[PDB]
Coordinates of C-alpha atoms (C1' of nucleotides) and ligand atoms in Angstrom, one line a residue:
Chain A
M1 CA 87.8 84.4 120.4
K2 CA 84.6 82.9 119.1
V3 CA 82.0 83.9 117.7
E4 CA 78.5 82.2 118.4
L5 CA 74.8 82.1 117.5
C6 CA 72.4 83.5 119.5
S7 CA 69.2 80.4 120.7
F8 CA 66.0 81.8 120.5
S9 CA 67.4 84.4 116.6
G10 CA 70.4 83.3 115.5
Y11 CA 72.0 85.8 116.0
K12 CA 75.7 85.8 116.0
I13 CA 78.1 87.5 118.5
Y14 CA 81.2 88.9 119.4
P15 CA 82.6 88.2 122.9
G16 CA 82.3 91.0 124.1
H17 CA 77.7 91.1 124.3
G18 CA 75.2 88.8 126.4
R19 CA 74.6 86.6 128.8
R20 CA 74.3 82.9 128.8
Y21 CA 72.1 80.7 130.8
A22 CA 71.9 77.7 132.5
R23 CA 69.2 76.0 133.2
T24 CA 69.5 73.5 136.1
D25 CA 68.4 70.1 133.9
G26 CA 71.9 70.0 132.7
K27 CA 71.3 72.4 129.8
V28 CA 73.0 75.9 128.3
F29 CA 72.0 79.0 125.9
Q30 CA 73.5 81.9 125.3
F31 CA 71.2 84.5 124.4
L32 CA 71.9 88.9 123.3
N33 CA 69.7 91.5 124.9
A34 CA 66.5 90.8 127.0
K35 CA 64.7 91.5 123.9
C36 CA 65.9 87.5 123.6
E37 CA 65.9 86.1 126.4
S38 CA 62.2 88.1 127.9
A39 CA 61.0 86.3 125.1
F40 CA 63.2 83.0 125.7
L41 CA 61.9 83.0 129.6
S42 CA 58.4 83.2 128.5
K43 CA 57.8 80.6 126.2
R44 CA 57.4 81.8 123.0
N45 CA 57.7 80.2 120.3
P46 CA 60.6 81.2 117.6
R47 CA 58.7 80.6 114.7
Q48 CA 55.4 83.7 115.3
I49 CA 58.3 86.3 115.8
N50 CA 59.1 87.2 111.9
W51 CA 62.1 89.2 112.7
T52 CA 64.5 85.6 113.6
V53 CA 66.0 84.1 110.8
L54 CA 64.0 80.7 111.4
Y55 CA 60.3 82.3 110.5
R56 CA 62.7 83.7 107.3
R57 CA 64.0 80.1 106.2
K58 CA 60.3 78.6 106.7
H59 CA 58.2 80.9 105.1
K60 CA 60.9 81.2 102.7
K61 CA 61.1 84.5 102.8
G62 CA 64.1 85.9 99.9
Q63 CA 64.5 84.4 97.1
Chain B
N1 CA 61.4 142.5 97.6
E2 CA 60.4 144.2 100.4
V3 CA 55.8 142.6 100.3
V4 CA 56.7 139.2 99.3
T5 CA 55.1 135.4 100.3
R6 CA 57.0 132.3 101.2
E7 CA 56.1 128.6 101.9
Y8 CA 58.6 126.5 104.5
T9 CA 57.6 123.8 107.1
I10 CA 58.6 123.6 110.5
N11 CA 59.2 120.8 113.0
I12 CA 57.6 121.4 116.4
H13 CA 59.3 118.1 117.8
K14 CA 62.8 119.5 118.4
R15 CA 60.8 123.3 120.2
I16 CA 58.9 121.6 122.3
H17 CA 60.6 119.1 123.5
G18 CA 60.5 118.0 127.4
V19 CA 57.7 120.2 128.7
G20 CA 54.5 118.7 130.9
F21 CA 51.2 117.5 129.0
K22 CA 49.7 121.0 129.8
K23 CA 51.8 123.3 128.3
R24 CA 52.7 122.4 125.4
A25 CA 50.5 122.7 122.4
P26 CA 50.9 126.9 124.0
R27 CA 54.3 127.2 123.6
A28 CA 54.3 125.6 120.0
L29 CA 52.4 129.4 119.9
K30 CA 55.3 130.8 121.2
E31 CA 58.2 128.8 118.8
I32 CA 55.9 129.5 116.0
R33 CA 56.5 133.4 116.5
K34 CA 60.1 133.4 117.3
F35 CA 60.6 131.7 113.9
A36 CA 58.8 134.9 112.1
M37 CA 60.6 137.7 113.7
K38 CA 64.5 135.7 113.7
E39 CA 62.7 134.7 109.4
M40 CA 61.4 138.1 108.5
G41 CA 62.2 141.4 110.5
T42 CA 59.8 142.2 112.1
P43 CA 58.5 142.3 115.3
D44 CA 54.9 142.6 114.6
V45 CA 53.4 138.7 113.4
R46 CA 49.8 138.2 113.7
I47 CA 47.9 134.9 113.3
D48 CA 45.5 133.1 111.3
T49 CA 42.8 131.2 113.4
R50 CA 42.9 127.9 111.0
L51 CA 46.2 127.3 111.8
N52 CA 45.6 127.3 115.5
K53 CA 42.4 125.1 115.3
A54 CA 45.0 122.7 113.4
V55 CA 47.5 122.6 116.4
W56 CA 44.3 122.2 118.8
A57 CA 43.2 119.5 116.9
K58 CA 44.3 116.8 119.2
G59 CA 44.4 118.4 122.2
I60 CA 47.5 120.0 124.7
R61 CA 50.0 116.5 124.9
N62 CA 49.5 115.0 121.6
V63 CA 51.1 117.5 119.0
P64 CA 51.8 117.0 115.9
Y65 CA 55.0 116.5 115.1
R66 CA 55.5 118.6 110.8
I67 CA 53.8 121.1 109.3
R68 CA 53.9 124.2 107.0
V69 CA 52.6 126.9 107.0
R70 CA 52.5 131.0 104.2
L71 CA 54.2 134.0 105.8
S72 CA 53.6 137.1 104.8
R73 CA 54.9 140.6 105.0
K74 CA 52.5 143.5 104.2
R75 CA 52.6 147.5 105.2
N76 CA 49.6 148.9 107.6
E77 CA 46.9 149.9 105.2
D78 CA 44.3 150.3 107.5
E79 CA 46.5 151.0 110.4
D80 CA 49.2 153.7 112.4
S81 CA 51.1 151.7 114.6
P82 CA 54.6 152.9 116.2
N83 CA 55.8 149.1 113.5
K84 CA 55.3 149.9 109.5
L85 CA 54.8 146.6 108.0
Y86 CA 53.4 143.6 109.6
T87 CA 53.7 139.5 108.9
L88 CA 51.1 137.5 109.0
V89 CA 50.5 133.6 109.4
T90 CA 48.8 130.8 107.3
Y91 CA 47.8 127.5 106.9
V92 CA 48.4 125.2 104.6
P93 CA 47.0 120.5 104.0
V94 CA 48.6 118.5 103.4
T95 CA 48.7 114.3 102.7
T96 CA 53.1 113.9 103.4
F97 CA 56.7 116.3 103.7
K98 CA 58.2 114.2 102.4
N99 CA 60.7 116.0 99.9
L100 CA 59.6 119.5 100.6
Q101 CA 61.3 122.5 100.1
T102 CA 61.3 126.7 101.1
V103 CA 60.0 127.6 97.5
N104 CA 59.2 131.1 97.1
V105 CA 55.3 132.1 95.8
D106 CA 55.4 134.4 93.4
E107 CA 51.7 136.8 93.3
Chain C
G1 CA 85.1 107.6 122.6
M2 CA 85.5 104.0 124.5
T3 CA 85.2 100.5 123.4
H4 CA 86.7 97.3 123.9
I5 CA 89.2 95.1 123.3
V6 CA 90.5 91.4 122.9
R7 CA 93.7 90.2 123.8
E8 CA 95.9 87.3 125.0
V9 CA 98.0 86.7 128.4
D10 CA 101.8 85.9 129.1
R11 CA 101.6 86.7 132.6
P12 CA 103.1 83.5 134.5
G13 CA 102.4 81.7 137.6
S14 CA 98.2 82.8 137.7
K15 CA 94.8 81.1 136.4
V16 CA 94.6 83.0 133.0
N17 CA 97.4 82.8 131.9
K18 CA 98.0 81.5 128.1
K19 CA 94.3 82.7 127.8
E20 CA 92.0 85.4 126.5
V21 CA 90.6 88.1 128.6
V22 CA 88.7 91.0 127.2
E23 CA 88.6 94.5 128.9
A24 CA 88.3 98.4 128.1
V25 CA 90.0 101.2 126.8
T26 CA 88.8 105.1 125.6
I27 CA 91.1 107.0 122.8
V28 CA 92.0 110.2 122.5
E29 CA 93.1 111.8 119.8
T30 CA 96.1 113.8 119.1
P31 CA 97.1 115.5 116.1
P32 CA 100.5 116.6 115.7
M33 CA 101.6 119.4 117.9
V34 CA 103.1 123.5 116.5
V35 CA 105.9 124.9 118.4
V36 CA 105.5 128.9 118.4
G37 CA 108.0 130.4 121.4
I38 CA 110.6 129.9 124.0
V39 CA 111.2 130.6 127.6
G40 CA 113.8 130.5 129.9
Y41 CA 113.2 130.6 133.7
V42 CA 116.1 131.3 136.5
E43 CA 116.4 129.6 139.9
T44 CA 115.9 132.2 143.7
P45 CA 115.9 131.8 147.1
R46 CA 112.3 132.5 146.7
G47 CA 111.6 130.1 143.6
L48 CA 111.5 130.1 140.1
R49 CA 111.7 133.6 138.5
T50 CA 110.4 133.9 134.3
Chain D
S1 CA 93.8 96.3 111.3
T2 CA 94.9 93.5 114.6
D3 CA 97.9 91.3 112.6
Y4 CA 95.1 88.6 112.6
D5 CA 91.8 90.2 111.5
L6 CA 93.0 92.1 108.2
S7 CA 89.6 93.6 107.3
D8 CA 89.6 97.3 106.2
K9 CA 87.8 98.8 108.8
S10 CA 89.2 102.1 110.9
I11 CA 88.9 102.6 114.1
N12 CA 85.5 105.4 113.4
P13 CA 82.0 103.2 114.8
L14 CA 78.8 102.9 112.5
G15 CA 77.0 106.1 113.1
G16 CA 80.3 107.7 114.1
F17 CA 81.4 108.1 118.0
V18 CA 77.9 109.7 119.8
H19 CA 78.9 113.5 119.9
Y20 CA 82.0 114.1 119.5
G21 CA 81.9 113.8 115.5
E22 CA 84.8 111.3 112.9
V23 CA 88.6 110.6 113.6
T24 CA 90.7 110.8 111.0
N25 CA 93.7 111.6 112.9
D26 CA 96.6 109.9 114.9
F27 CA 95.2 109.0 117.7
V28 CA 96.6 106.7 121.8
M29 CA 94.3 103.7 123.4
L30 CA 94.4 104.2 127.1
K31 CA 93.4 100.8 129.4
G32 CA 90.3 101.2 131.6
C33 CA 89.5 105.5 132.3
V34 CA 89.6 109.0 132.7
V35 CA 88.0 111.4 133.9
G36 CA 85.8 114.5 132.1
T37 CA 83.3 114.3 129.8
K38 CA 84.1 114.0 126.4
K39 CA 85.3 116.4 123.9
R40 CA 87.3 117.3 126.7
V41 CA 91.0 118.4 126.4
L42 CA 93.7 115.8 128.3
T43 CA 97.1 116.5 129.9
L44 CA 99.0 113.2 128.8
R45 CA 102.3 113.1 131.0
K46 CA 105.2 110.6 131.5
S47 CA 105.6 109.3 135.3
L48 CA 108.3 110.6 136.7
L49 CA 108.5 106.9 138.8
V50 CA 110.5 104.5 138.3
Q51 CA 108.3 101.4 136.8
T52 CA 110.3 97.6 138.0
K53 CA 106.3 95.8 138.3
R54 CA 105.9 93.0 135.7
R55 CA 102.3 94.3 136.0
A56 CA 104.0 97.2 133.9
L57 CA 107.4 96.2 132.1
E58 CA 104.8 93.1 130.4
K59 CA 104.4 94.1 126.8
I60 CA 100.6 93.7 124.9
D61 CA 99.8 92.2 121.2
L62 CA 96.5 93.1 120.3
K63 CA 93.7 90.2 118.7
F64 CA 89.9 91.8 118.3
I65 CA 88.6 95.5 118.3
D66 CA 85.1 95.9 118.8
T67 CA 83.5 99.1 116.1
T68 CA 80.1 98.5 117.1
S69 CA 78.0 101.2 117.2
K70 CA 77.1 102.3 120.7
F71 CA 73.8 103.9 119.5
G72 CA 71.5 100.9 120.6
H73 CA 72.8 97.7 120.5
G74 CA 75.7 97.1 117.9
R75 CA 75.8 93.6 116.1
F76 CA 77.0 94.6 113.6
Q77 CA 80.6 95.4 112.9
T78 CA 81.1 96.8 109.1
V79 CA 78.0 97.9 106.7
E80 CA 79.5 95.2 104.8
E81 CA 78.7 92.4 106.8
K82 CA 74.8 93.3 107.6
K83 CA 74.0 94.1 104.2
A84 CA 75.5 90.5 102.9
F85 CA 73.6 89.2 106.3
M86 CA 70.1 90.3 105.8
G87 CA 70.3 91.4 101.9
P88 CA 68.2 93.5 99.6
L89 CA 65.9 95.9 100.5
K90 CA 63.4 99.0 99.3
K91 CA 66.8 100.5 98.3
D92 CA 66.3 99.2 94.6
Chain E
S1 CA 98.5 77.5 143.5
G2 CA 96.1 80.1 141.9
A3 CA 93.8 82.8 142.7
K4 CA 89.8 83.7 143.0
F5 CA 88.9 86.3 141.7
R6 CA 86.7 88.4 142.4
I7 CA 82.8 88.0 141.3
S8 CA 79.6 89.4 141.8
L9 CA 77.8 88.4 146.0
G10 CA 74.7 87.2 145.6
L11 CA 73.2 85.4 148.6
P12 CA 73.5 87.5 151.7
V13 CA 72.4 85.8 155.5
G14 CA 69.3 84.8 156.0
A15 CA 68.5 83.0 152.8
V16 CA 67.1 79.5 152.3
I17 CA 69.2 77.5 149.5
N18 CA 68.4 74.3 148.2
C19 CA 71.1 71.3 149.3
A20 CA 71.4 68.9 145.8
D21 CA 73.5 66.0 147.8
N22 CA 71.7 62.7 148.6
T23 CA 71.8 63.1 152.8
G24 CA 68.0 64.0 153.2
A25 CA 68.3 68.0 153.9
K26 CA 65.8 70.5 151.3
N27 CA 67.1 73.4 152.5
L28 CA 69.8 75.0 154.2
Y29 CA 69.9 78.1 155.9
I30 CA 73.0 80.3 156.5
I31 CA 73.3 82.5 159.6
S32 CA 77.6 83.3 159.0
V33 CA 80.4 82.8 156.1
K34 CA 83.6 82.4 156.7
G35 CA 86.5 85.0 155.5
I36 CA 84.1 88.7 156.5
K37 CA 86.1 91.3 159.0
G38 CA 83.4 93.8 158.1
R39 CA 82.2 96.9 158.6
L40 CA 79.8 98.3 160.4
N41 CA 76.0 97.4 159.9
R42 CA 76.8 95.5 156.1
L43 CA 75.4 92.2 156.1
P44 CA 77.7 89.1 155.0
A45 CA 77.3 88.2 151.7
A46 CA 78.2 84.7 150.2
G47 CA 79.2 83.7 146.8
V48 CA 80.2 80.5 144.4
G49 CA 83.4 78.6 146.2
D50 CA 82.9 81.0 148.6
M51 CA 82.0 78.4 152.5
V52 CA 79.9 79.0 154.9
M53 CA 77.5 77.6 157.9
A54 CA 74.2 76.4 158.0
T55 CA 71.9 74.8 159.5
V56 CA 68.8 72.8 158.2
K57 CA 64.2 73.8 158.7
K58 CA 63.2 70.8 156.3
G59 CA 64.8 67.4 156.9
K60 CA 65.7 64.4 158.9
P61 CA 65.0 64.9 162.0
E62 CA 68.8 63.8 163.1
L63 CA 70.5 66.1 161.2
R64 CA 68.2 69.4 162.1
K65 CA 68.8 71.7 165.5
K66 CA 73.0 71.1 164.1
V67 CA 75.6 73.7 162.3
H68 CA 77.5 72.3 159.5
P69 CA 79.0 73.5 156.9
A70 CA 77.9 74.4 153.1
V71 CA 79.9 75.4 149.6
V72 CA 77.5 76.9 146.9
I73 CA 77.9 75.8 143.6
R74 CA 75.4 77.5 142.0
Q75 CA 73.2 81.1 142.2
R76 CA 71.6 83.1 139.9
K77 CA 72.9 87.0 140.2
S78 CA 74.6 87.0 136.9
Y79 CA 78.8 87.1 137.7
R80 CA 81.7 87.9 134.9
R81 CA 85.0 85.4 133.4
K82 CA 87.1 87.7 132.3
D83 CA 85.9 85.6 128.8
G84 CA 83.9 88.7 129.1
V85 CA 80.7 86.8 129.7
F86 CA 77.8 86.6 132.4
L87 CA 76.8 83.7 133.5
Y88 CA 73.3 82.0 136.0
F89 CA 71.5 79.7 136.7
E90 CA 68.1 79.5 137.5
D91 CA 68.8 78.5 141.0
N92 CA 71.0 78.6 144.9
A93 CA 72.5 75.1 145.4
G94 CA 74.7 74.5 147.9
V95 CA 76.2 71.0 149.7
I96 CA 77.3 69.9 153.4
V97 CA 81.0 69.1 153.8
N98 CA 83.5 69.4 156.5
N99 CA 86.5 71.4 157.9
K100 CA 88.6 69.3 155.8
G101 CA 86.4 70.1 152.6
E102 CA 85.3 66.7 152.2
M103 CA 82.1 66.1 150.7
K104 CA 79.3 64.2 153.2
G105 CA 77.7 62.7 150.2
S106 CA 78.0 61.1 147.4
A107 CA 76.0 62.8 144.3
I108 CA 75.1 66.0 143.1
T109 CA 72.6 67.0 140.8
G110 CA 72.9 69.6 138.0
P111 CA 75.1 71.4 137.3
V112 CA 78.6 73.2 139.3
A113 CA 80.3 75.9 138.4
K114 CA 83.9 75.9 137.1
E115 CA 84.3 78.5 140.0
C116 CA 84.2 76.5 143.0
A117 CA 84.8 72.7 140.7
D118 CA 89.2 74.7 140.6
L119 CA 89.3 75.5 143.8
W120 CA 87.0 72.0 146.2
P121 CA 88.5 68.8 144.1
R122 CA 86.5 66.3 146.0
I123 CA 82.9 68.2 144.7
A124 CA 84.7 68.3 140.7
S125 CA 84.9 64.6 141.0
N126 CA 81.2 63.6 142.2
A127 CA 80.0 65.9 139.5
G128 CA 77.9 64.5 136.4
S129 CA 78.1 67.6 134.2
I130 CA 80.3 71.7 135.0
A131 CA 79.6 74.6 134.6
Chain F
rC1 C1' 88.7 130.1 105.8
rU2 C1' 83.0 133.3 103.0
rG3 C1' 80.4 131.3 107.6
rG4 C1' 77.4 129.8 110.6
rG5 C1' 71.7 128.6 110.9
rU6 C1' 66.5 126.7 108.7
rC7 C1' 64.1 122.4 105.9
rG8 C1' 65.7 118.7 102.4
rG9 C1' 68.9 113.9 101.4
rG10 C1' 71.6 109.3 103.1
rG11 C1' 74.2 106.5 107.3
rU12 C1' 72.8 104.7 112.8
rU13 C1' 69.5 102.9 115.9
rU14 C1' 64.3 101.0 118.3
rC15 C1' 59.4 98.5 118.0
rG16 C1' 57.9 94.6 114.7
rU17 C1' 55.4 93.3 109.7
rA18 C1' 51.1 100.3 107.8
rC19 C1' 45.7 101.8 104.9
rG20 C1' 44.1 100.3 101.3
rU21 C1' 43.8 96.1 97.4
rA22 C1' 43.8 90.9 95.5
rG23 C1' 42.8 85.7 97.4
rC24 C1' 40.1 78.9 95.1
rA25 C1' 43.1 80.4 102.7
rG26 C1' 38.8 80.5 106.7
rA27 C1' 34.9 77.4 112.0
rG28 C1' 30.4 78.4 109.4
rC29 C1' 25.3 80.8 107.8
rA30 C1' 21.3 81.7 106.3
rG31 C1' 18.5 85.5 101.8
rC32 C1' 19.4 85.4 96.4
rU33 C1' 18.3 82.1 92.0
rC34 C1' 21.8 80.6 86.1
rC35 C1' 19.9 75.8 93.0
rC36 C1' 25.1 77.7 91.9
rU37 C1' 25.1 76.4 98.2
rC38 C1' 32.7 77.8 95.2
rG39 C1' 27.3 81.7 91.6
rC40 C1' 26.2 85.7 94.0
rU41 C1' 25.0 90.6 98.3
rG42 C1' 27.8 88.6 101.4
rC43 C1' 27.2 87.1 107.1
rG44 C1' 32.4 87.2 108.1
rA45 C1' 36.8 87.6 114.0
rU46 C1' 40.7 85.1 112.0
rC47 C1' 45.2 84.0 108.1
rU48 C1' 49.6 84.3 103.1
rA49 C1' 51.2 87.8 98.7
rU50 C1' 52.3 93.2 97.9
rU51 C1' 55.7 93.4 103.2
rG52 C1' 62.5 92.7 107.6
rA53 C1' 56.7 96.8 106.0
rA54 C1' 54.9 101.8 108.2
rA55 C1' 56.6 105.7 111.9
rG56 C1' 59.9 107.8 115.2
rU57 C1' 65.1 109.0 114.5
rC58 C1' 68.6 116.1 118.8
rA59 C1' 65.8 118.7 120.4
rG60 C1' 72.5 117.8 124.1
rC61 C1' 73.4 111.8 117.5
rC62 C1' 77.4 111.7 112.3
rC63 C1' 78.1 113.4 106.9
rU64 C1' 76.4 116.6 103.0
rC65 C1' 76.8 121.4 100.0
rG66 C1' 71.3 120.0 98.0
rA67 C1' 66.9 124.6 98.0
rC68 C1' 66.4 129.7 101.2
rA69 C1' 67.2 133.7 103.2
rC70 C1' 70.6 135.8 106.5
rA71 C1' 75.2 138.4 107.8
rA72 C1' 78.7 146.5 109.2
rG73 C1' 74.9 147.0 112.8
rG74 C1' 73.5 149.0 117.5
rG75 C1' 74.1 150.3 123.1
rU76 C1' 78.1 151.4 128.1
rU77 C1' 82.8 153.2 129.2
rU78 C1' 89.4 153.2 130.3
rG79 C1' 94.9 157.5 129.5
rU80 C1' 101.7 155.7 131.3
Chain G
rC1 C1' 20.0 135.7 148.0
rC2 C1' 19.5 130.3 149.9
rA3 C1' 25.9 129.9 150.0
rU4 C1' 34.2 127.3 147.2
rA5 C1' 30.8 135.6 147.4
rU6 C1' 24.9 138.4 150.0
rC7 C1' 23.5 132.7 156.0
rC8 C1' 26.7 132.4 161.5
rG9 C1' 32.2 132.1 162.0
rC10 C1' 36.0 140.0 162.8
rA11 C1' 36.6 139.2 156.0
rG12 C1' 33.9 137.6 149.4
rC13 C1' 37.6 132.6 155.6
rA14 C1' 38.9 124.4 151.8
rG15 C1' 34.3 125.3 158.6
rG16 C1' 29.7 124.9 159.8
rU17 C1' 23.7 125.5 157.4
rC18 C1' 16.8 121.8 156.6
rU19 C1' 13.8 121.2 152.2
rC20 C1' 11.6 119.4 146.1
rC21 C1' 12.8 117.5 140.9
rA22 C1' 16.3 113.8 138.6
rA23 C1' 18.5 111.6 131.5
rG24 C1' 22.7 108.0 127.3
rG25 C1' 26.0 103.4 128.4
rU26 C1' 28.7 99.7 131.4
rG27 C1' 27.5 97.5 135.6
rA28 C1' 23.7 93.6 140.6
rA29 C1' 23.2 98.8 141.2
rC30 C1' 20.8 106.9 143.8
rA31 C1' 29.7 102.7 143.2
rG32 C1' 33.7 104.7 140.1
rC33 C1' 34.3 105.9 135.0
rC34 C1' 33.4 109.0 129.8
rU35 C1' 29.0 112.0 127.6
rC36 C1' 23.2 115.9 126.6
rU37 C1' 19.8 119.8 129.3
rG38 C1' 21.9 123.6 131.8
rG39 C1' 26.6 126.4 134.3
rC40 C1' 32.1 127.5 134.4
rA41 C1' 37.0 129.9 133.8
rU42 C1' 40.8 126.7 138.6
rG43 C1' 39.2 129.3 142.8
rU44 C1' 42.3 136.8 146.7
rU45 C1' 47.9 137.4 140.4
rG46 C1' 51.2 136.1 136.3
rG47 C1' 55.6 134.3 133.1
rA48 C1' 61.1 132.8 132.5
rA49 C1' 64.6 128.1 133.5
rC50 C1' 64.0 122.3 136.0
rA51 C1' 69.7 123.0 141.8
rA52 C1' 69.3 121.3 147.1
rU53 C1' 66.1 119.9 151.3
rG54 C1' 60.5 118.8 150.8
rU55 C1' 54.7 117.5 150.0
rA56 C1' 51.3 114.0 147.3
rG57 C1' 52.6 109.7 143.7
rG58 C1' 55.8 105.0 141.0
rU59 C1' 59.3 101.9 139.4
rA60 C1' 63.5 98.8 140.9
rA61 C1' 68.3 93.1 139.8
rG62 C1' 69.4 89.0 143.9
rG63 C1' 67.8 88.5 149.3
rG64 C1' 63.5 88.2 151.5
rA65 C1' 61.6 91.4 158.6
rA66 C1' 68.9 90.6 158.7
rG67 C1' 65.6 96.6 159.7
rU68 C1' 63.0 98.5 164.5
rC69 C1' 60.4 98.6 171.3
rG70 C1' 56.5 96.5 168.0
rG71 C1' 56.0 93.8 160.3
rC72 C1' 54.8 101.2 161.7
rA73 C1' 53.7 102.6 156.9
rA74 C1' 54.0 99.9 151.8
rG75 C1' 53.0 95.6 149.1
rC76 C1' 50.0 90.6 148.5
rC77 C1' 44.7 88.2 147.6
rG78 C1' 40.5 90.9 146.1
rG79 C1' 34.2 90.5 141.2
rA80 C1' 30.8 85.7 139.3
Ligands
MG1 MG1 76.0 104.3 124.0
MG2 MG1 72.9 99.0 163.0
MG3 MG1 36.1 112.7 137.5
MG4 MG1 44.4 131.7 136.8
MG5 MG1 36.6 132.7 146.3
MG6 MG1 64.7 93.4 144.7
MG7 MG1 65.4 92.3 165.0
MG8 MG1 69.6 95.5 166.2
MG9 MG1 48.6 98.2 158.5

RNA sequence: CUGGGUCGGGGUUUCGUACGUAGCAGAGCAGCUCCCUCGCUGCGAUCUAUUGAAAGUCAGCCCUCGACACAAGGGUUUGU
RNA sequence: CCAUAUCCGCAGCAGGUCUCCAAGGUGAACAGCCUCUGGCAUGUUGGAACAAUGUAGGUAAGGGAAGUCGGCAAGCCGGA
């Protein structure tokens, strides 16, 4: 088994969950639930969405 | 002991649940009437109008989720019906329902 | 209740051999039973009889 | 706990089993699915046939078991990882 | 000497997938599939790896008004691999072949699915990406 | 089995960061006059800090043993 | 009285029967949506629970008329 990280957020995945997507340019993305997909597909940058890891690292939230 | 009063808080959201938009608040008052009847073993119940206003204060669809009251037993001073006791329900206004218990008031 | 499980596979001649798979299960609770009594039967041309 | 993960975890999910409770007893683990609702009583009988097909004779050794909560979209195995990831909340 | 491992079918008859290779085609109107007996009032669906019979609707006059075989390479309908992952490819695409499985063009655009590269080796060679 | 109910507290989980206060953040603005136009009445969407916060969470989710009373009573029939 | 109860329709019948007066907001507008003056108690009865088939409304992964005598019905476009 391998764990993988979501592509919109940076949360973890265990191997029973999720979906995977392969845009026809020759790239793949992992997603964890319908919430995150719809965000990705609707062309939203995760650095505003304040429940994600990237936001928390950019605004130095925590520490 | 047989003339007594005390305070409660009630969760309406779990008693009215699954009901349509034209029967929610009216069934609240029925439930309240059930609550007392099982609580104080009395089949006679009155309701104060301040309480009714509170329930209908956001219409008939949207009914608040919790509320506090006061119950009182009484002994038919100016009434002679086949019942000898009656209960009474009144309203208490509150900013927050946190951490509150069923206290017993003494007067 | 129910859940799922990962295991490894040693079915030979397959396309999933020496690999991992994912599959569901059911969980069944089972304390130990207790014996209280006995009953003995007998065989007859109408069937059995207690 | 398999022979591989070696985490001090139980079979019970987070938030317990839905509509049932908390298992504190010996259990068995079946492949697939069964009849009936939860909390229902089952009977488990030995097979009346002979078993020679490889798909019956084979043997198994597990690697991983999932203890996510089923009362939503579980994403953590245990509370301990839930805390180490997030951090200290207003429970201070 | 393996298997195929049934998957979820997405492309019934009446669909127009796009073609990937470099022969001149743009569309492929499906008309039937290989390997279906059938049931009353059911439509013969198709998936990845499945070989089908197709016509062209946009391309060169030399190819139109004729029947060809084709093989499917990408679909948008989620399907399960035995590793517990569901997958999809943004589009529906095919390529033209002959009976024996030898492909007619020389190149392929985009990614090919693992589930057809196993069966058809000649397609697998000409593909840049995979899965 | 002293039990089960009502409220409460925790667990899980859904959406996505509450009112207020502070801000030398803020396109600009004309009034004030200590002309200061960073000093102010302030006009002002929006942004940042308190704040992964607030709100909801069995009514057919999990656990408690914390508070409250309550539970011996009723009615109709049955013979080898 | 002058009409979803005083008129005709067998009846306090969802039918039909000539005219006058005519506010605030949005908006091109006596359109449609909310309100004040004035009027009413849901239109010949009520309570409990949410099975089947119905009538009126809605939504649906992938494909898109392959359905059917027939794109019938629904849906798309819709103002400046
Ligand atoms: Mg679940
Ligand atoms: Mg037919
Ligand atoms: Mg109206
Ligand atoms: Mg009525
Ligand atoms: Mg009438
Ligand atoms: Mg559809
Ligand atoms: Mg036809
Ligand atoms: Mg036909
Ligand atoms: Mg029409």
